[PDB]
């Protein structure tokens, strides 16, 4: 409980970093698709929201497998994050708002912040094995 | 959930490869006159859609179908060629060469961007696997 | 990344204008012929933000 609570903030921030990078990679993949508004999330507000109320999913239901021969299958699943629209910079005839400079800057920034989260969490876990080890 | 980036970027790479292949096929047949069925070659183009099943927020990209490009067939007056029309109007493909070259360049650039995404994602997965160690 | 498409449109329409001019010149001996005028119209793309 205590150890779970102490390591919960950085763990949740790192998970939200992963989901934000999935969203940014989806934006980069759809960069040439006509009629695709770029999506992004407000990291701080969603992080506090996940902090106060635990993580949740839109659906994520799945077929139950009582026997050992039942065929496993799961329907669509996604986080409970609010996918907001990014304000376009300049217009385009095809009708997508994926501006590549913004996408690649957010991608690199999210990359470094995820590495920072990994460093902090690893430092804390060593900072604990140091105490326990004897 | 960094594993889903593998699927997203792989789908994007496959779709951009298909688009580049279709553009190159159109470009290589700009001067064609005949098809396997005798019909004139019709310039073709892919259709890009969000690869998201119903209820999925954001996915990669997928090629729905390949469609004939909407443009008038280029009429050439050669009523000596064995293939001709009632008035000798040979029908040639409606390929716009500049458009195909720009499409090839764009597909190559998007492909390379997706490769960079995959590379940095794999590096991050390795670093995550080196979390506490 | 989308200025390439603006320039490509300009080049393709320049090709179209050249085709019109060549078709006009090919009929310098056509009896009772009326030349086709050509003009490049500019289409401003609407949207946001600038």
């Amino acid at each position: 409980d205590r150890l779970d609570a102490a390591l919960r903030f950085q763990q949740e921030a790192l998970n939200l970093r992963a989901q934000r990078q999935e969203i940014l990679a989806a934006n980069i993949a759809n960069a040439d698709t006509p009629g695709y508004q770029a999506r992004d999330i407000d990291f701080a507000s969603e992080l506090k929201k996940v902090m106060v109320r635990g993580r949740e999913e839109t659906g994520g239901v799945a077929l139950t497998l009582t026997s050992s021969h039942h065929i496993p299958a799961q329907a669509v699943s996604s986080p409970a994050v609010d996918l907001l629209y990014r304000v376009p910079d300049q217009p385009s005839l095809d009708g997508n708002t994926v501006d590549m400079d913004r996408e690649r800057t957010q991608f690199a920034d999210n990359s470094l912040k995820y590495q920072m989260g990994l460093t902090v969490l690893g430092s804390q876990l060593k900072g604990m094995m140091n105490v326990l080890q004897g | 959930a960094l594993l889903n980036i593998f699927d997203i970027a792989g789908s994007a790479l496959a779709a951009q490869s298909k688009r580049l292949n279709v553009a190159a096929s159109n470009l290589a047949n700009a001067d064609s006159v005949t098809g396997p069925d005798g019909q004139p070659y019709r310039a073709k183009q892919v259709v890009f859609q969000v690869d998201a099943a119903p209820g999925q927020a954001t996915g990669g990209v997928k090629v729905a179908s390949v469609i004939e490009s909407q443009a008038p067939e280029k009429l050439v007056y050669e009523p000596g060629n064995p293939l001709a029309d009632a008035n000798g109007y040979v029908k040639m493909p409606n390929v716009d060469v500049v458009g195909e070259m720009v499409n090839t360049m764009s597909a190559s650039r998007s492909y390379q961007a997706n490769i960079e995404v995959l590379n940095t994602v794999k590096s991050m997965m390795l670093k995550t696997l080196t979390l506490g160690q | 990344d989308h200025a390439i498409y603006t320039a490509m449109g300009a080049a393709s329409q320049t090709l179209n204008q050249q085709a019109v001019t060549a078709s006009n010149l090919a009929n310098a001996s056509t009896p009772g012929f009326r030349a086709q005028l050509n003009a490049l119209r500019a289409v401003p793309v609407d949207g946001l933000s600038l």
Binding site: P34, G35, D94 | Q45, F48, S106 | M8
Partner: peptide
């Protein structure tokens, strides 16, 4: 609804 990427959807289309 997606559409054709690149040249076709970035050239001024016919009105209708």
């Amino acid at each position: 609804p997606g559409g054709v990427p690149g040249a076709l959807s970035n050239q001024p289309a016919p009105p209708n």
